[PDB]
Write a protein that binds this ligand. Structure first.
Ligand SMILES: *Cc1c(COP(=O)(O)O)cnc(C)c1O
Ligand SMILES: *Cc1c(COP(=O)(O)O)cnc(C)c1O
Lengths: 385, 241, 385, 241
């Protein structure tokens, strides 16, 4: 279960059978002609793939640096790349003969994505969510219910995401025979980190073809934000063997790396073993998980995908950080300049790509992965600003 | 690594404080054939609500890894009852397999169980464990195939720990025990969530070499805090009859 | 400027010059190769066109009638077909050498669409909105401001849309030299009713090609909701000469045609002359405009495009109505069954298409125009239901 | 159709009520050379805030088309001052061009202006208007080309009504200059007169008539039924008497 020294399948024996079986299924369908035929079918007619590669003519000229292109994942049904992975695992679960999907959610984004896919494929969907978050996410909970899923509030412990995750796991161990556990990012034990990446590679593939069609050549840099790392891995992957192409991940710098109020796991964490994987985690002095922060919910995670740790190690990819203030600026800028309101997570990549573009020549090319639309963050922003 | 028919208590080190844990150990010692001591982790995985909460308590009160070894070492000044350390891989990884196992042995620890370290990934661990004089404890669940069961037994030098998928003991749990006895060479301890005398009796009757009691106890430690000592004995007493 | 007996250019002399000039511009660019080249360029890379034609397999089988396809306009950048028209007129305004765009809005949908296009093409955007609506639309106003447009609250009169419209008109009459007035639907004086239709014909064109590719033949029926009638006209038009194809418009039946709480202008109004056009309006006994209602904001209009009046007249298209309750049901149904949350306006078409499908054979084909996503209506729904 | 140098007042029928309108008319009659009476419409187009609001007031108080004709007919019992009816096309369309024009003539109306009916679309209207004995009034704006200006004049049998795009704008005077230099008909100007100097300057520049509407309806909006006296005071100010 490995990406260099990272990855693994570090979980209690009770989770081994379900995992082992998932590995088998993924192997037989990973390349099954019929499976992919359907996967592409839904991705196309339901999700809206492909997404366009947009040239921010006005923004690039305002900076006077390199050319800036945006992979518009903000246009997929649902408003975020998360939908790619949801459809994939839900379809796989269906082929496995499962009838129920379960997942947990904090902000509610993964919850909704899962709910939609379940509805599309006609599966029962139970979503675990900390009672704390249930209160905070009025509209997302309603959205999930509208989609036919039933959100199960967990009140044990801190009544937050962590408590919901455990409820989900317990559930799966007992019902894995007919229930699939839908992980939302390239994290967790094998085979998730890699399965999720595979279901997101479409992004990179499309972008490659697209940039060649527009510029007749591969890009100089590819910038994507990194929470768990699934949208970044999805667009990076297809370019991993194209040495010319520079890959840059942007983690949440929150209120400054020098303030403990961030989530830069790769840019400040130590390797460790949590959530079933050996990767980088923002740890305590005693090997305990530290609290994290970020204005962008999807970036607020103490860990990171094993595959990113591996890319950082072998130095195939460079990881940086951007502050809440910077991301917030990019949020407004993209809105006023290109008429596209980005998700706060994406705004981080936009922000870094902007300053990075300024230090390059007018003939260079940067592709930024706009992972989602910012409709979901209006309240967050409207409040602070 | 414990006498047959033994009752094995489980406690989370540092819940509510390092001293109280030592006290609870000493108070229960006489009724136990072996003791399982858990090292607090920030992210337990499907560990079960009652136990899961004890971890949070312990860490909230500022628990620290050395305090675990201290409890074991201090306990050793009075008893020799087998002590099995239960922890997640991170702490031992962060410190060095051999280094951790060494300090454990030196503190008076007899066996260890790494909760989130798959059997097929513990080859090197079981190896250094032997060389450091620490017995290995691996667990198996109802969904564990007879195939892995054998492999688990083949790597266990302490005893196989059977646990249930989720207070009538599930039919599924007895089936695990049945197969286990019929397949393992090692002694088998069961943690099926015993809460009443009938469980202990029925389980031993079915071939359980040992019966673990954790939830029933930590639940009390959660309700009585530092003043749990007496209530713990009363409960243990009930379970042994 | 006429569609049969309907249409016209009924406005004060002060509006004639701006209108006459707009007519000229539209003529020279309507088919200018460069103009369309750019129009398609933005429609593609920025708006996300084309949108897929989705087959609601599960919904059609649940009904056991004809096959139901959905033109996913809910996926265009912005979440509604309105974006097609916004980009068109804004681009035309730019080619005309204008530098400012102005428009008025009630719910805020047209306001936002205009704001986005203006931002894309780099134009000043001033949006008129009744102070009443400004209070009611917290999030939309914020959206418009984020996009760089400045929303001008009007407090004169009832502080509603009507009062905002007049403010916009007055503005245009004085600044039309460098300012373009962006109308949101196939209504108003010439040349708007037809210009807007042209900028929405893409919908029908795409859908035609798409249904042929999927079924090898044209559809039996096309169903679309009708407020002003721009999304309906956009998908209808390309099929107007295909006699096999039945066209059905769905107006807001609100709380029942027999309760005065609706907006079925074509299914209950008398011809008249308002807002610069000769068409059907829900009139008073004394030729005055009556109050209208509908759970779907975009359907709450006392009038209707001249071209729809014309189609109704010559009986080329059939117009029906659906109640708030019915539309609301379709809203939930589509969500649970296909994993697509529609806009309340669209839900009307979905609702009618559903009952219409039941009365047809399993080999027949219905295409429903899903004009927009329902994210915007969660509050409305969440409240009532 | 009115004596040169005449001051022409404008009032919205039914603001605040049909009776009050008749009262205002009678009170101003002596200072006017002709009067413009507006028929309330639900959707005035770029009619100007002050006037636009009067329309809403009138309709809110339940105004009805016949009440307009009533005011005119009742006013005819005392005066013969020319009355020009100003309305949008819908009411006359909804009732029948000839039918409307007929009832208008019978009520004592002299001329009519259909605000939202383009010159090039009023061929049949001007035709029936003649046959019904009603004079036509068409308006022109600064942005109106000399070309249309002629056509407007060629169809006007009452007088061309000049209005400004919004101190009287330089643009407005230019319209007047061209108008006098092109039209055969008398020209009335509605440039938003508010002080004596305007009336004087405009007449001086060739305006056959000077319309005063906003200045008056603004008062009718502030004083309601009690506007009579204040209206005279204002009219007197504008006439310089
Ligand atoms: C959740 C989210 C992310 C971050 O997660 P990754 O797994 O790192 O991709 C980024 N962008 C959007 C729009 C998201 O919703
Ligand atoms: C505004 C709107 C409508 C109604 O307007 P038309 O001009 O009749 O198309 C319909 N659907 C959606 C999604 C809308 O936003």
């Amino acid at each position: 279960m490995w990406f260099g020294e990272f990855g693994g399948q570090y979980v209690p024996e009770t989770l081994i059978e379900p995992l082992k079986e998932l590995e088998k299924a993924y192997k037989r369908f990973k390349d099954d002609e019929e499976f992919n035929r359907q996967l592409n079918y839904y991705l196309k007619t339901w999700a809206g793939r492909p997404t366009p590669l947009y040239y921010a003519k006005r923004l690039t000229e305002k900076i006077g640096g390199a050319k800036i292109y945006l992979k518009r994942e903000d246009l997929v049904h649902g408003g975020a790349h998360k939908t790619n992975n949801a459809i994939g695992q839900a379809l796989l679960a269906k082929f496995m003969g499962k009838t129920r999907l379960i997942a947990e959610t904090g902000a509610g984004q993964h919850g909704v994505a899962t709910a939609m896919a379940g509805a599309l494929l006609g599966m029962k969907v139970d979503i675990y969510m900390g009672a704390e978050d249930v209160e905070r996410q009025k509209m997302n909970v309603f959205r999930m219910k509208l989609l036919g899923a039933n959100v199960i509030p967990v009140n044990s412990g801190s009544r937050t995401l962590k408590d919901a995750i455990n409820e989900a796991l317990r559930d799966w161990v007992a019902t894995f025979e007919y229930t699939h556990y839908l992980i939302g990012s390239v994290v967790g034990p094998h085979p998730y980190p890699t399965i999720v990446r595979d279901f997101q590679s479409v992004i990179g593939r499309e972008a490659k073809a697209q940039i060649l069609e527009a510029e007749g050549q591969l890009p100089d840099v590819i910038v994507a934000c990194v929470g768990g790392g699934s949208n970044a891995m999805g667009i990076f992957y297809p370019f991993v063997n194209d040495k010319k192409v520079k890959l840059v991940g942007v983690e949440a710098g929150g209120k400054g790396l020098e303030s403990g109020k961030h989530s830069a796991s790769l840019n400040a964490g130590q390797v460790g073993v949590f959530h079933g994987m050996l990767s980088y985690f923002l740890q305590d002095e005693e090997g305990q998980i530290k609290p994290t922060h970020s204005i962008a919910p999807g970036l607020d995670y103490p860990g990171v995908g094993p595959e990113h740790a591996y890319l950082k190690k072998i130095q195939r990819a460079e990881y940086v950080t951007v502050t809440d203030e910077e991301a917030l600026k990019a949020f407004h800028e993209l809105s006023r300049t290109e008429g596209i309101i980005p998700a706060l997570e994406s705004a981080h990549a936009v922000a870094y790509a902007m300053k990075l573009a300024k230090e390059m020549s007018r003939d260079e090319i940067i592709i930024v992965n706009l992972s989602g639309r910012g409709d979901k963050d209006l309240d967050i922003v409207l409040k602070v600003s | 690594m414990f006498k047959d028919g033994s009752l094995i208590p489980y406690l989370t080190a540092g819940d509510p404080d390092k001293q109280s844990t030592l006290n609870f150990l000493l108070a229960l010692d006489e009724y136990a054939g072996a003791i399982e001591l858990g090292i607090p982790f920030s992210d337990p995985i499907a560990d079960g609500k009652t136990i899961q909460e004890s971890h949070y308590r312990a860490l909230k009160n500022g628990f620290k890894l050395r305090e675990a070894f201290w409890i074991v070492k201090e306990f050793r000044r009075h008893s020799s009852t087998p002590i099995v350390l239960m922890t997640y891989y991170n702490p031992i990884y962060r410190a060095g397999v051999r280094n951790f196992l060494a300090e454990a042995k030196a503190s008076g620890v007899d066996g260890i169980l790494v909760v989130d370290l798959p059997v097929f990934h513990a080859k090197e661990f079981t190896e250094i464990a032997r060389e450091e004089g620490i017995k290995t404890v691996f667990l198996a669940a109802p969904n564990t195939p007879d195939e892995r069961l054998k492999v688990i037994d083949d790597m266990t030098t302490g005893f196989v720990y059977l646990v249930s998928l989720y207070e009538e003991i599930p039919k599924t749990a007895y089936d695990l025990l049945r197969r286990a006895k019929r397949i393992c060479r090692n002694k088998v301890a069961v943690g099926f969530g015993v809460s009443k005398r009938e469980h202990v009796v029925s389980l031993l009757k079915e071939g359980a070499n040992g019966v673990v009691v954790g939830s029933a106890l930590v639940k009390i430690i959660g309700e009585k805090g530092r003043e749990a000592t007496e209530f713990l004995k009363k409960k243990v007493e009930e379970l042994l009859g």
